[PDB]
Amino acid sequence: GSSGSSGLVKEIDMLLKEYLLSGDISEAEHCLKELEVPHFHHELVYEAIIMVLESTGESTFKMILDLLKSLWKSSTITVDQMKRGYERIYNEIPDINLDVPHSYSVLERFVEECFQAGIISKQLRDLCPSRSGPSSG
Question: What contacts 103, CB < 8 A, 6 or more positions away?
């Protein structure tokens, strides 16, 4: 097969992987910029969200949450570059709802915090998928 340097989209992933293994937004920040690939930003955000839905434990939820936040405020990610990430998910959530049922919920929770942080728009906050079911007290 391919030993290494097979796909580019992978570059983004790896970065996030190390960010979670190390736990330092600063590091990721540099790594990203070091990739000199701005056109490959919309993907990053998309992957991050997938990490929280795919992975279990408030851990990823937090780290990832802050990751996107900081990076954004760090004039690294533009509104759009961020909006795209969410959209793809809201539309690609169907395939994720297969293995990840809570996905819908987990996503709503993650997106919520983001909105408050002031990184996304009301369009995204709402766009997020919402299915009535367990929601009960």
Answer: 53, 93, 96, 97
Q: Are 125 and 112 in contact (CB under 8 A)?
A: yes
Token match 């367990």: residue?
134
- Terminal CA-to-CA distance of the chain, rounded, Å? 52
Q: Which value, in Å, is the radius of gyration of the alpha carbons in the chain?
A: 15
Dihedral over Cα of 11, 27, 43, 99: its sign? positive
Element (H, E) at 124: helix 122-127
Map out the domains of the chain with their CATH numbers.
1-137 (1.25.40.180)
One-letter amino acid identity for 111? V
- Structure tokens of 64? 């990832």
